[PDB]
Design a protein around this nucleic acid. Structure first.
Lengths: 149, 361, 129, 83
RNA sequence: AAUUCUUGGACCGGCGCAAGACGGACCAGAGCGAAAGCAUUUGCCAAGAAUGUUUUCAUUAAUCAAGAACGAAAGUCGGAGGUUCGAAGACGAUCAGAUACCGUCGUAGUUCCGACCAUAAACGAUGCCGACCGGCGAUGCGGCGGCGUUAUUCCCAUGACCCGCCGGGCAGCUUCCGGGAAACCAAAGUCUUUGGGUUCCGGGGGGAGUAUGGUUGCAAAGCUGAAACUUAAAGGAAUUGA
């Protein structure tokens, strides 16, 4: 079930058995690597690079076409953004809810949902601290959380 | 208003709902129009507008959800104006306007791939337009007065395909595409058009430099097909030397020599060679081969014409030159045919050729 | 969430047997499950089984016979000393005649009979009788 | 049914089952070679695209994103790619 | 029936004016929400489940002393407002008596803004997370596939029906799954064949949620919470009588 909801949703991807790249695909490891570099440097998250490839170019999964995961390509090349692109999105949402809530003061629901999002920021922030993706000093504080975009 | 730091960054927030479901499709050209009628400063309303307009006309074509349905006359005339203004402001601006370093701004956007495949996003506008114009013609009652009201824009189109042709900053090699376009409009322009630019004999009548401006057009097939053929013996594709030569053959018919155009039709050897192309090539081959037999007759070669016009009239399915013929066998493919079908005024009359078999015999 | 995998494997066998099915599907297979089911099979409480192999945790289709009464897990995995096998198999098993306690020793995963045979303790996983 | 062949289900039954609840999970999606009415070049498009796939040079737009499968525009033939 | 209103024209009928409450019928064993709760239109703002996915990260998770957010109704303090209804109270009847039921008035209150209080039969009288074990017909949202009907008449294509399949949700019917003291419950089942993970909490009936100490609140009161003493039953489901 969902972390902060009563729902029990079963909706995600289902990878096929065969990890082999199909015959029709002519894009080689270096061609998709040049493509990934171009998309990331345009300004685009590992998620959005992945969907662009499979929709338009027809790249089933980059881990089979290449030997790497999109972020390991980008962090090897040194195009990986510092604070991760799920921690980023949680902070971005939390700022968007607080900016709404600073105006609409009697929004008791927005107050409750802000508490849930922030509990999720802390919980993911500490995972990244243990795995040495962040400094041990890294803090989520709503005072100067907007400094992080 | 601000040095394309707000203009190129709204252009993208309005050219993002292109083809998304809940876009409405209609109140988009408006927002693309309120970036040249609200933009009114140098390279901020005047100079970078190449790009704002490329995305104004591309979205204007996309007022039609289907690609098997014809545009409406209002947005059609709007396109024919919208396309013209780009050409007139592009001519007197000798620069490549999707990149290629000039000064510093507002061109030189080489950050995005390469200014060729979107620098040649000018002919794929007017080429899409030429393929659009055929839908207007196919989707009208041919005996109606609306048809001739619609053919009044045949002149408007051939002026823009001339203007894009005069634009020779090509890189024949790859302008061949709009040479095929240009000849596909002129290859069947009749004797009154062909003859009456010299057949007022050249004296103090019509050989002055200011009158001899439309006599370029008959000896244009030779000027242009020569290139489009003898470069594509080297270049890749099949269609832009086979459509080009059959246009040259068909044009060297219906006014000029039987002997001139039989050498070209034998040189190609399509008699036994054209088997495995696409029907939209195999149709204008039939039109050419029928025009062979008519020219031979009109010359007075009244058995070599009969020895040619046999199997077309021998078979009841001679409607490979016109609209679709008989009923059933595959609705699923009969739907595909009524956008293959050739336009009306191009069709050669069929009680004209029935009266060429049954007079040569 | 799924904290004990052997617990759910043995409960799903038990319900399938009671209901009177001929074979059953075990979802997340593991060495400990396959090593539990081989001990069961070796005495002949289950028939053959076939571990279906996707690129994840596998699946097991076990051919049930109708000669298994109960197969149960013991969580947590207590440290059964050799001098405690008797007082465990006294209150877990139905009789001194049939039934087995499979326990994970240094040697491998085996029943109380072979653990006594090789003079070894270990940790209790479950029982079948 | 007490006896059911769990190992060898017939294709119709495990074509019906939810994509995860099959014996070896497999996607219900695919890739399709799709072409425009004018141009000759073909484009590879995902069954459930979720972007707008523009014909190369933005000559036109092929698909449109929706809830499930991406709606291909009218007058565009397609041939689903297989391995 | 009376208290009340009315020839300083009540009640009834017409045309307007203002006020402050409230959103009928549509409204359902329908929906959404963490629970309290939520219904005229339209606009703006941020949020959210489910579905779809050959996208991404790679164990980041489940439950939780301490601590924290919200919490019907009533109630307290301050400002605005006061249509209806109406604790208190003023009567009028009935009655042996009525300090009530019934009836005419009626202050606090009911409504809005800002501070409190933190409880309800706050109920599914039923903690949460995970797996397994019968069938049927519908239903709400998302997807997917298929004769045919109807609108866009040009019907590609969308919408309204029809027939099935998949996943989440509110429920229903049925049976010797099985359980249970039974009433009954596909969970309250997989329990002497007793062990998947974890929080809270009960120990005969009273005395008593009382005394006392602590803590919170302006007050009302909330949370924590005994003892002496008394007692052989109190109680649950179902049966047969009256």
């Amino acid at each position: 079930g969902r972390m902060h909801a009563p729902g029990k949703g079963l909706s995600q991807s289902a990878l096929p058995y065969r990890r082999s790249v199909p015959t029709w695909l002519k894009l080689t490891s270096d061609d998709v690597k040049e493509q990934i570099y171009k998309l990331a440097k345009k300004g685009l998250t590992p998620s959005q690079i992945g969907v662009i490839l499979r929709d338009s170019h027809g790249v089933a999964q980059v881990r089979f076409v290449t030997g790497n995961k999109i972020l390991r390509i980008l962090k090897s090349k040194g195009l990986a953004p510092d604070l991760p692109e799920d921690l980023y999105h949680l902070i971005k949402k939390a700022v968007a809810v607080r900016k709404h809530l600073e105006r609409n003061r009697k929004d008791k629901d927005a107050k409750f949902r802000l508490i849930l999002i922030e509990s999720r920021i802390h919980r993911l922030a500490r995972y990244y601290k243990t795995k040495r993706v962040l400094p041990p000093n890294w803090k989520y504080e709503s005072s100067t959380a907007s400094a992080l975009v | 208003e601000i040095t394309h730091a707000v203009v190129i960054k709204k252009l993208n927030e309005i050219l993002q709902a292109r083809g998304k479901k809940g876009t409405d499709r209609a109140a988009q050209i408006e927002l693309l129009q309120l970036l040249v009628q609200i933009a009114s400063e140098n390279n901020l309303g005047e100079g970078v507008i190449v790009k704002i307009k490329f995305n104004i006309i591309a979205s204007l074509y996309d007022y039609n959800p289907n690609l098997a349905t014809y545009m409406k006359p209002e947005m059609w005339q709007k396109c024919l104006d919208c396309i013209n203004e780009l050409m007139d402001i592009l001519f007197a601006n000798p620069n490549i306007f999707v990149g290629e370093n000039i000064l510093e701004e507002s061109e030189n956007l080489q950050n995005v791939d390469q200014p060729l495949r979107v620098r040649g996003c000018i002919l794929t506008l007017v080429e899409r337009m030429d393929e659009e114009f055929t839908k207007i013609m196919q989707n009208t009652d041919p005996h109606s007065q609306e048809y001739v009201e619609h053919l009044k824009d045949e002149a408007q189109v051939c002026a823009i395909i001339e203007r894009v042709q005069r634009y020779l900053e090509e890189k024949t090699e790859e302008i061949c595409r709009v040479y095929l376009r240009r000849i596909l409009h002129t290859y069947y322009k009749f004797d009154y058009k062909a003859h009456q630019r010299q057949l007022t004999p050249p004296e103090g009548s019509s050989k002055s430099e200011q009158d001899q401006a439309e006599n370029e057009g008959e000896d244009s097939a030779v000027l242009m097909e020569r290139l489009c053929k003898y470069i594509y013996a080297k270049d890749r594709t099949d269609r832009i030397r086979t459509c080009a030569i059959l246009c040259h053959i068909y044009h060297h018919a219906l006014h000029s020599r039987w002997y001139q155009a039989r050498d070209l039709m034998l040189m190609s050897h399509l008699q036994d060679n054209i088997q495995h192309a696409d029907p939209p090539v195999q149709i204008l081959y039939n039109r050419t081969m029928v025009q062979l037999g008519i020219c031979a007759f009109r010359q007075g070669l009244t058995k070599d014409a009969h020895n040619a016009l046999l199997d077309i009239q021998s078979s009841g399915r001679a409607k490979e030159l016109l609209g679709q013929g008989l009923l059933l066998r595959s609705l699923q493919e009969r739907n595909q045919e009524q956008e293959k079908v050739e336009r009306r005024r191009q069709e050669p009359f069929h009680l004209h050729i029935n009266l060429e078999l049954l007079e040569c015999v | 969430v799924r904290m004990n995998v052997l617990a759910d494997a043995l409960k799903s066998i038990n319900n399938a047997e009671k209901r009177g099915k001929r074979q059953v599907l075990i979802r997340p297979c593991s060495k400990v499950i396959v090593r539990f089911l081989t001990v069961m099979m070796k005495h002949g409480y289950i028939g053959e089984f076939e571990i279906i192999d996707d690129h994840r945790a596998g699946k097991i289709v076990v051919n049930l016979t109708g000669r298994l009464n109960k197969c149960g897990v013991i969580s947590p995995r207590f440290d059964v000393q050799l001098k405690d096998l008797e007082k465990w198999q006294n209150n877990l098993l139905p009789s001194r005649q049939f039934g087995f306690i499979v326990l994970t020793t240094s040697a491998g995963i085996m029943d109380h009979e072979e653990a006594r045979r090789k003079h070894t303790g270990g940790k209790i996983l479950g029982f079948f009788f | 049914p007490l006896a059911k062949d769990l190992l060898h289900p017939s294709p119709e039954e495990e074509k019906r089952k939810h994509k995860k609840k099959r014996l070896v999970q497999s996607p219900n999606s695919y890739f399709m070679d799709v072409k425009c009415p004018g141009c000759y070049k073909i484009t590879t498009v995902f069954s459930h695209a979720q972007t707008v796939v523009l014909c190369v040079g933005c000559s036109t737009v092929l698909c449109q994103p929706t809830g499930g499968k991406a709606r291909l525009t009218e007058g565009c033939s397609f041939r689903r790619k297989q391995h």
